Amino acid sequence: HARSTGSYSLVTQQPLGGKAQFGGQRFGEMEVWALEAYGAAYTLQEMLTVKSDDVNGRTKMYKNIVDGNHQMEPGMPESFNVLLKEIRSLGINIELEDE
């Protein structure tokens, strides 16, 4: 099975999972530790933001690769904002404190 770009979930907005529904392979916690151990920063970032649940980053990635320029423009993943909203609904104030 293989997949380049397909459908996305609704809540977390990352690509689905499964051959029957044309999903993408999960990059689990162990593999994150491995790339961390190499010191592999850029590949880890591109597998965390622009090839995953970040809507603007992934569409920009598609547009740029179609244009031949190999560069990333990362952004804040949607799952993080999902977590922020959930924990705020818990009644505890969390916020990204600028500086």
Partner 1 sequence: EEFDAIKIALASPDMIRSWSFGEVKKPETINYRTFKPERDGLFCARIFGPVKDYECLCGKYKRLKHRGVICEKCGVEVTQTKVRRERMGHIELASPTAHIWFLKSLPSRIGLLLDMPLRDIERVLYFESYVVIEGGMTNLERQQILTEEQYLDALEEFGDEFDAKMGAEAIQALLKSMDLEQECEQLREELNETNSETKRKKLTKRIKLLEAFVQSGNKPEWMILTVLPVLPPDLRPLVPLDGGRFATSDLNDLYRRVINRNNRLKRLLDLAAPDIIVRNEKRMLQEAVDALLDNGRRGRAITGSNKRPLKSLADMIKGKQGRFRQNLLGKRVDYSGRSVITVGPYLRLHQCGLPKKMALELFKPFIYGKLELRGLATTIKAAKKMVEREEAVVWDILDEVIREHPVLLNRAPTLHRLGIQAFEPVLIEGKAIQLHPLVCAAYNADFDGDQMAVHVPLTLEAQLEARALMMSTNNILSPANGEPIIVPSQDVVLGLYYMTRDCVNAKGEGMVLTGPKEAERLYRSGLASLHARVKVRITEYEKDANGELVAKTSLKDTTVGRAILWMIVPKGLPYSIVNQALGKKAISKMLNTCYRILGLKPTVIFADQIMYTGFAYAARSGASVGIDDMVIPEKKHEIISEAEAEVAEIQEQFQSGLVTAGERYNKVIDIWAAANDRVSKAMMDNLQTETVINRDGQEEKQVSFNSIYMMADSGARGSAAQIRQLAGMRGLMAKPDGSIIETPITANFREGLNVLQYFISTHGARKGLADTALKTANSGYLTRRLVDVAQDLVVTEDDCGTHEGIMMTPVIEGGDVKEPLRDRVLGRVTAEDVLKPGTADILVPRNTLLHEQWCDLLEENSVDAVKVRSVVSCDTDFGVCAHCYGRDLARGHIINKGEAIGVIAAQSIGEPGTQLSIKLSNVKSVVNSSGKLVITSRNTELKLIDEFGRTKESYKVPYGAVLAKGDGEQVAGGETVANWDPHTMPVITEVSGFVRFTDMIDGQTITRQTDELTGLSSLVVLDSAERTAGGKDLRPALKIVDAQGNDVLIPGTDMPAQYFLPGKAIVQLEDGVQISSGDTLARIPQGGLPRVADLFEARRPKEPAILAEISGIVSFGKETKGKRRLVITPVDGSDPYEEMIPKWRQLNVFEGERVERGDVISDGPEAPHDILRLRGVHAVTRYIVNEVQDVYRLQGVKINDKHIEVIVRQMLRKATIVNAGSSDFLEGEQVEYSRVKIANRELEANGKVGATYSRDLLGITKASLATESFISAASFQETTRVLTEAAVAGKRDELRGLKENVIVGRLIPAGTGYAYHQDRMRRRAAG
* Residues at the contact surface with DNA, assessed by CB under 7 A: 1, 17-20, 23, 25-26, 28-30
Q: How far is the CB of 96 from RNA (least distance, A)?
A: 27
Judged by CB under 7 A, the residue of 10, 66, 90, 96 near RNA is: 10
**What does the alpha-carbon distance between residue 73 and residue 1 come to, in Å, rounded to a whole number?**
28
Q: How far is the CB of 52 from DNA (least distance, A)?
A: 13
**What does the alpha-carbon distance between residue 13 and residue 29 come to, in Å, rounded to a whole number?**
19
Q: How far is the CB of 40 from DNA (least distance, A)?
A: 18
**Range 18-47, binding partner 1 (CB under 8 A):** 23-47
Closest to 72 (Cα-Cα) out of 95, 54, 85: 54
Judged by CB under 7 A, the residue of 5, 17, 43, 83 near RNA is: 17
Q: List all residues 6 or more positions away from 34 whose beta carbon is below 8 Å from its beta carbon.
A: none
DSSP 63: H
- Could you say whether residue 5 binds RNA (CB under 7 A)? no
DSSP 23: -
Nearer to DNA, 25 or 81 (CB): 25
